[PDB]
Curated annotation (Swiss-Prot), chains A, B, C:
Start-end of each Tau/MAP repeat: 1-31, 32-50
Function of the molecule: Promotes microtubule assembly and stability, and might be involved in the establishment and maintenance of neuronal polarity. The C-terminus binds axonal microtubules while the N-terminus binds neural plasma membrane components, suggesting that tau functions as a linker protein between both. Axonal polarity is predetermined by TAU/MAPT localization (in the neuronal cell) in the domain of the cell body defined by the centrosome. The short isoforms allow plasticity of the cytoskeleton whereas the longer isoforms may preferentially play a role in its stabilization.
Location in chain, cross-link Glycyl lysine isopeptide (Lys-Gly) (interchain with G-Cter in ubiquitin): 7, 24, 37, 43, 47
Locations listed in the record: Cytoplasm, Cytosol; Cell membrane; Cytoplasm, Cytoskeleton; Cell projection, Axon
Summary of subunit composition and partner proteins: Interacts with MARK1, MARK2, MARK3 and MARK4. Interacts with PSMC2 through SQSTM1. Interacts with SQSTM1 when polyubiquitinated. Interacts with FKBP4. Binds to CSNK1D. Interacts with SGK1. Interacts with PIN1. Interacts with LRRK2. Interacts with LRP1, leading to endocytosis; this interaction is reduced in the presence of LRPAP1/RAP.
Residues bearing carbohydrate: 6-7
Protein's name in the database: Microtubule-associated protein tau
Gene: MAPT
Lineage, opening ranks: Eukaryota, Metazoa, Chordata, Craniata, Vertebrata
UniProt note on tissues of expression: Expressed in neurons. Isoform PNS-tau is expressed in the peripheral nervous system while the others are expressed in the central nervous system.
Site feature Not glycated, where: 16, 20, 24, 37, 43, 47
Organism this protein belongs to: Homo sapiens
Processing and modification events after translation: Phosphorylation at serine and threonine residues in S-P or T-P motifs by proline-directed protein kinases (PDPK1, CDK1, CDK5, GSK3, MAPK) (only 2-3 sites per protein in interphase, seven-fold increase in mitosis, and in the form associated with paired helical filaments (PHF-tau)), and at serine residues in K-X-G-S motifs by MAP/microtubule affinity-regulating kinase (MARK1, MARK2, MARK3 or MARK4), causing detachment from microtubules, and their disassembly. Phosphorylation decreases with age. Polyubiquitinated. Requires functional TRAF6 and may provoke SQSTM1-dependent degradation by the proteasome. PHF-tau can be modified by three different forms of polyubiquitination. 'Lys-48'-linked polyubiquitination is the major form, 'Lys-6'-linked and 'Lys-11'-linked polyubiquitination also occur.
Effect of substituting residue 27 to L: In FTD1; most common mutation; reduction in the ability to promote microtubule assembly; accelerates aggregation of tau into filaments
Residues that bear Phosphoserine: 11, 19, 31, 50
Residues found modified as N6,N6-dimethyllysine: 37
Length: 50, 50, 50
């Protein structure tokens, strides 16, 4: 079992104006289990110039 | 088993204007378990010029 | 088992104007368990020039 993720960003100018993230990279060799059951009322709000 | 993540980011100018993150990188060789059940009212708010 | 995460950032100018993070890198050889169940009312707020 070979799993590969490759990502590039190349920029003159790059911007992100507000972001939110719950579970990011979770690699597991033998096994992975996720039990995602929040009472979620989370908000992301932004006003931007770019 | 062989799990690979590669990420390159290149910029002349780069800006992040507010961010929030709950669980980041969680590599487990034998096993991983995640039991994600918050009561979540989290906010991200931002005002920017870039 | 082989787990790899590789990340590069290269920048002339780089800025982050406000950020928040609960659980960062959690590497485990045999097993990893995360039981994320907070009553979370966290705010990330920022006002910025960049």
């Amino acid at each position: 079992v070979q799993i590969i993720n490759k990502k590039l960003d190349l920029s003159n100018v790059q911007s992100k104006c507000g972001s939110k993230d719950n579970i990011k990279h979770v690699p597991g060799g033998g096994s992975v289990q996720i039990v995602y059951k929040p009472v979620d009322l989370s908000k992301v709000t932004s006003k931007c110039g770019s």
